[PDB]
Paper text:
To investigate the molecular basis for haemoglobin binding by TcHpHbR, we mixed the receptor with HpSPHb. This generated a complex of TcHpHbR bound to Hb. Each receptor makes the same interactions with haemoglobin, and the receptor conformation is unaltered from that of unliganded receptor, with a root-mean-square deviation of 0.6 Å. The membrane-distal binding site interacts with the α-subunit of haemoglobin. The smaller, membrane-proximal part of the binding site contacts the β-subunit of haemoglobin with a total contact surface area of 650 Å2. While an alignment of these structures shows little alteration in the membrane-distal binding site, the path of helix I of the receptor is altered in TbHpHbR so that it no longer forms the membrane-proximal binding site for the Hb β-subunit, thereby reducing the total interaction surface area by nearly half.
The T. congolense receptor (TcHpHbR) was identified by sequence homology to the receptor from T. brucei and also binds to HpHb with low micromolar affinity (a KD of 8 μM for TcHpHbR compared with 1 μM for TbHpHb).
Numbering used by the authors:
A (entry chain A): 3 to 251
B (entry chain B): 3 to 247
C (entry chain E): 2 to 141
D (entry chain C): 2 to 142
E (entry chain F): 3 to 146
F (entry chain D): 3 to 147
Amino acid sequence: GEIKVELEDSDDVAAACELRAQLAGVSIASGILLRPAVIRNATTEFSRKKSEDILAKGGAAVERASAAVDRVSGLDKTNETAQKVRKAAAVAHHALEHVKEEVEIVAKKVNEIIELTAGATEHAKGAKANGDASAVKVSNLLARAKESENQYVKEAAEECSESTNYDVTAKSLAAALDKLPGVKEDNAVKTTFQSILTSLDNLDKDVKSVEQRAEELETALEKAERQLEKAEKAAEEAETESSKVETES
Amino acid sequence: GEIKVELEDSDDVAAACELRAQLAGVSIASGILLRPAVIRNATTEFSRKKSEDILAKGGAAVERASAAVDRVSGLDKTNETAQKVRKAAAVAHHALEHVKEEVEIVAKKVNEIIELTAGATEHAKGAKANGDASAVKVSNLLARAKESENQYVKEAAEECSESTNYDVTAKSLAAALDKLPGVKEDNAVKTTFQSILTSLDNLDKDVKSVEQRAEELETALEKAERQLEKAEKAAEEAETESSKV
Amino acid sequence: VLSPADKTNVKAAWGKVGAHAGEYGAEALERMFLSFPTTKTYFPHFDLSHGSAQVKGHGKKVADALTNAVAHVDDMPNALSALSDLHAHKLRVDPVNFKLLSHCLLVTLAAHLPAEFTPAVHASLDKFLASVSTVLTSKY
Amino acid sequence: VLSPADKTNVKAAWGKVGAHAGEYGAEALERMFLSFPTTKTYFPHFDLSHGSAQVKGHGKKVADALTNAVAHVDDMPNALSALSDLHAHKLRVDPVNFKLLSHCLLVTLAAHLPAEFTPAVHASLDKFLASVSTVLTSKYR
Amino acid sequence: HLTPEEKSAVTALWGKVNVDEVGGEALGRLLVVYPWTQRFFESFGDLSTPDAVMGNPKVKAHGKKVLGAFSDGLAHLDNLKGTFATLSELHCDKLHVDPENFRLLGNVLVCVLAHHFGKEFTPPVQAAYQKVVAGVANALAHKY
Amino acid sequence: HLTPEEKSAVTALWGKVNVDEVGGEALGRLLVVYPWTQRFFESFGDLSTPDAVMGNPKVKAHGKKVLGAFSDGLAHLDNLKGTFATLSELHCDKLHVDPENFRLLGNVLVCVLAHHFGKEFTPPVQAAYQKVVAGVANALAHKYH
Ligand code: HEM
Ligand code: HEM
Ligand code: HEM
Ligand code: HEM
């Protein structure tokens, strides 16, 4: 269905013209909004593999210390000097339980980003489709106003340009819709206009939350790296005692 | 040594200015002259090893017919079936004699192009080295004219621009040198000037001869190809009658 | 720099485009996404399926830009001053992509204008589409 | 399009080059032939050996062209109208090579102007050298 | 790099191209659209105007030998690196043809095929020929 | 590939580069000279001015991780294809980064090394680094062809 309420005056026509331009500019806006969050979802595959590795290097640093502590099991039993060669291996396994902890975080964040991005795409296509559709109905309303039995309305619709607003936001659009409450609330577009405002607002809420989960994910990979350094240098540390001792008890 | 004869008047200074620009423009000229003949020398080895494979395909088309004529040997000089193989094989070996002939041409032309191009490069280097060295001596002569007690010579040398003539030829340069016979015949540059005129003339004589040896070459590879088609279709013709027994 | 002869050929060839401008633009873009799939990334919020109306819509917007550019060939930088900014500062399209659409536009015009797409015209159209690309890349 | 800010940086950086113009030119070319040996083909009649005087000579001719281009930044196409024709119709240099020398000129200026070649200036010099290349490539059609 | 459905449309269209002339139409178009490319073919004679370039028997001739190389790569799609190997030595080691020029000629061929086939040269078949010409460009610039 | 005399000058100079900062200087310079590359780093924060970019801790940080890849591939010159293989998947099939941008960053690194070493970054050593950066560009764009 088309918009039944006609453009009463020259000032009303001018608002509808800016509205046809705002609704057109929704197409550009969502694209620019969604795009960086898609770049972030592209790195989740790579950043997960980095975590499975820090775990692999961790498990291996644990196994190098677990073999080094096995060699010095039957050399000093409940003695004084060998109480130290077991301490670094304890530091090594404790550091791993932290590596294994942060890797679980990276995993959950990867799944969160995927789910958020897949979601935001639907909000950007949804805002786009409802954008372009409603602008058609507004253009037709202006096209009728170019025929209007009123000379001031006929000239305002004529002077009025077919343009696209490049700086559209959820705010600027609601502001353009406030100018024409009769169009804003007309049954032919009423829900479509309401569907854009929500879709745009949810799309920004998602893009921001993707930047957020990434910040949490990068923190975990740095913390997994800190503990891998702590594990390796505790492995190679008291495991140094394993090369110096070849003796028999 | 430097040029000893001084610039007498404003018209003399003007000729020396153009002659300098001409001598400067010799480097550009030889570069533009030599370059296409170097592109032609780059295709020689490709074309030789292309001729080598037309001979190999020829020899193989000959050996396929030479084996096909060995099978049909057990027959008299009366059967149409037995004679068509022997005759196509004769056509096949005769076609090879011309493949083998054109390949000798390709070989000699390749060696000729290499020798010509290697030669022309030295001419182009010699003409630029001598063309640029002499321009230095002419510039110094103009630099001394910017000091002259003549008000007209000092001003003409001053107005005179440090430029490079882009449309230099062996003709245009000799023409610029004719304007100043005192400079042209000065012992400090006389022979260097004569060395440019000869080097430039020989460089054009070589570049043109490279364009000629290549047409005479391409013709031979086409003629070797025509005869390879004539050999193969007489050889495959002999193989048609050899499977027939 | 477009010569009076180059200019005549453009105007004449785009003159023959006329009514079908919108369908052509849509094909140029569809050809671009298929041949160079990394171009699709600038449209994550678009339906890029075969014969989409989003692509049909965008197609006309790209062609009417070009129809305006032809009309204002002598003053092309001011004619597209709007887009040269939109592309540079808002979309941040890599300049290497302007070369890709320009070629797909030539592929479109070759397929539809058998007579007019001659070697003389092929040169003048590529000359022009390079100039359009230069304008759009001018604000980086 | 070079901004008034871009223009100031060029003039300032090439202002610091000064007498060393024919020095940095010879360097830029020597760097180009070594990094991109494909470029040497346009000079078959040249001695391209280390520290050649042919290359030293050509170097100054290339730099004085650039010194003129800086002086006439606002009207660069007419300033180099001579060369844009020489390169296009007489030499027939492939346009892809203008990109290579332009980079070697930046490599030269980075090595010699430690203070001057800042990120702000690096951008403005590359914008300028692209504009010089654009002028020289303008007559190829 | 091509899908069996693409290999099907590609070898289909190619069997319909006039081998005798489509090569000279691409090679001539290159020397007309990108004139600097003439520096390699100065011995070709008359190259002053597009009608003098298109008319040139040497251009149409060499055009046939160049298309013949395309007809070979279009047979040997699985192994392009080796097919064009001998030519890579000639175009890279000896003549030093900047690889973009191969790319330029490649796009010009695609333009000629579109000009000839029209509505038969559909976006997905263009997409497939693009893969081919990109391959033939890489296979030739392999020595770099 | 490189000559044993070049491999000698290359690994010489590289052992003198401040790994901690030369990476951020190249990455920052890329986003300053070629601004469109910024679409790839909108989460980095403030990038509005060259001094905001150069100052950005995320830029200097990420700069260190990209130089680390350069330090990695400079060791295994004989096998660059495999060294950068994991990264090729990220830059090509995931991010969809145009290969010329890798080339642009490569030339920017060469500009940074010249800016830092000066008369030590001689025409023949530049020539060798050029071969390296060309290799690292190809190895990364391997997933395209
Ligand atoms: C022949 C040159 C081109 C012209 C004339 C052109 C024209 C334009 C126009 C007129 C618009 C938006 C106008 C509106 O909707 O009101 C625009 C938007 C856009 N262009 Fe271009 N463009 C060109 C090349 C490019 C290229 C090479 C790309 C990148 C592959 C690009 C990607 C975009 C994108 C992403 C949009 C955003 C529009 C949206 O999201 O709805 N176009 N095009
Ligand atoms: C980008 C800035 C460039 C400038 C400012 C420039 C400047 C010039 C000038 C002024 C000349 C003429 C010298 C004279 O008057 O004698 C010229 C000649 C020449 N240029 Fe360029 N050029 C540039 C780029 C190129 C490039 C990229 C190439 C190589 C592909 C090229 C190759 C040549 C050659 C071969 C000559 C002729 C030299 C001779 O044979 O004497 N230059 N250069
Ligand atoms: C891109 C695909 C290309 C293919 C398939 C190709 C094919 C070949 C072939 C088959 C030949 C040898 C012809 C013969 O036997 O006489 C050759 C020669 C040659 N090609 Fe290419 N070529 C290509 C691109 C290039 C480009 C872009 C140029 C430079 C503009 C180049 C310049 C040459 C030259 C100068 C020769 C020597 C031909 C002669 O003058 O006799 N071609 N071409
Ligand atoms: C050519 C040399 C390059 C190398 C060696 C390289 C290396 C890498 C490395 C090692 C990472 C990820 C490191 C980590 O997260 O731990 C990566 C990430 C990235 N690279 Fe590259 N890169 C190069 C060039 C490019 C260029 C030219 C761009 C395009 C602008 C590109 C865009 C990116 C992006 C967007 C990321 C992801 C940043 C993030 O995780 O949020 N880089 N680089």
